[PDB]
């Protein structure tokens, strides 16, 4: 009985399933983004092991060297779920310094369902202990992997990024951007 399973299926069907196949095309709608080299087009989904964040990524405790900068948003994608509610999905583009080289552009986002794990652990510790929360993060990670890997339209469109609150996200992102296709 894993609360993370529902969190992963809902993250997919209520969001990723339709934003991931279109992400590259949405990005391509902006001339600046068409012109930019070193712009990896995958959604980097951030999964901090403590299920927590409280600020903008640039200059945050995860960016101690201040190497991450908000660049702008992608062109909104429209989607209608249920038949009644029109929703607009857009993503934040960040610039990540690469020493004296050309800086990278990338798409980064926290996995928002992790806030529920965090909220649960604080408001209902009897339901989710700290150690049970740690474990549900892993369950969440593995299930989301299975779901996304089972969808051919999502192949190559994302990368899950797990890290400890002590890690430097700029360092983590630089390695993942360099290793991207």
Ligand X SMILES: Nc1nc2c(ncn2[C@@H]2O[C@@H]3COP(=O)(O)O[C@H]4[C@@H](O)[C@H](n5cnc6c(=O)[nH]c(N)nc65)O[C@@H]4COP(=O)(O)O[C@H]3[C@H]2O)c(=O)[nH]1
123 assigned binding-site residue: no
Q: Give me the DSSP letters along 44-56.
A: EEEEETT----S-
Strands 39-48, 104-110: parallel, antiparallel or unpaired by DSSP?
parallel
Q: 45, 159 in Cβ contact below 8 A?
A: yes
Shorter beta-carbon distance to its own copies: residue 102 or 165: 165
Does residue 10 bind ligand X (CB under 6 A)?
yes
* Distance of alpha carbon 56 from alpha carbon 28, whole angstroms: 25
Q: What minimum distance in Å lies between the beta carbon of 54 and its own copies?
A: 4
Does residue 7 bind its own copies (CB under 8 A)?
yes
Does residue 123 bind ligand X (CB under 6 A)?
no
Does residue 15 bind ligand X (CB under 6 A)?
yes
* Distance of alpha carbon 61 from alpha carbon 114, whole angstroms: 18
Shorter beta-carbon distance to ligand X: residue 10 or 65: 10
| Partner in contact with 98, chosen from its own copies, ligand X, none, beta carbon below 5 to 8 Å by kind | none
Strands 92-96, 104-110: parallel, antiparallel or unpaired by DSSP?
antiparallel
**The Cα angle at residue 78 between residues 76 and 83, in degrees rounded to 5:** 160
User: Tokens 């089972």 — which residue?
Assistant: 150
Q: Which of residues 85-104 bind ligand X (CB under 6 A)?
A: 85, 87-90
* Distance of alpha carbon 71 from alpha carbon 88, whole angstroms: 19
Does residue 17 bind ligand X (CB under 6 A)?
no
Q: What minimum distance in Å lies between the beta carbon of 14 and ligand X?
A: 3
Q: By CB under 8 A, which span of 20-28, 71-79, 95-103, 119-127 interacts with its own copies?
A: 119-127
8 assigned binding-site residue: no
* Distance of alpha carbon 163 from alpha carbon 118, whole angstroms: 16
Q: What minimum distance in Å lies between the beta carbon of 29 and ligand X?
A: 16
Q: Residues annotated in the binding site for 2',3'-cGAMP, as ranges?
A: 15, 81, 87-88, 112
Q: Catalog residues that contact ligand X under the rule CB under 6 A.
A: 10-11, 14-15, 85, 87-90, 109, 112-113, 116
């Amino acid at each position: 009985k894993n609360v993370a399973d529902g969190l992963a299926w809902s993250y997919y069907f209520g969001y990723l399933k339709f934003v991931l196949p279109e992400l590259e095309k949405q990005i391509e709608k902006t001339s600046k983004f068409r012109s930019k080299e070193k712009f990896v087009k995958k959604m980097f989904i951030l999964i901090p092991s403590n299920c927590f964040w409280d600020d903008k990524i640039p200059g945050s405790d995860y960016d101690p060297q201040n190497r991450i900068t908000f660049e702008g948003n992608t062109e909104p994608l429209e989607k209608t779920r249920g038949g009644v509610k029109l929703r607009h999905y857009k993503h934040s583009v960040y610039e990540i310094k690469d020493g004296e080289n050309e800086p990278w552009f990338c798409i980064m986002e926290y996995a928002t369902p992790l806030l529920t794990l965090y909220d649960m652990s604080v408001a209902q510790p009897g339901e989710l202990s700290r150690e049970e929360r740690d474990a549900q993060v892993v369950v969440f990670l593995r299930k989301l992997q299975d779901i996304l890997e089972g969808d051919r339209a999502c192949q190559g469109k994302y990368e899950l990024v797990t890290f400890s609150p002590d890690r430097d996200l700029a360092d983590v992102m630089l390695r993942k951007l360099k290793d991207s296709e």
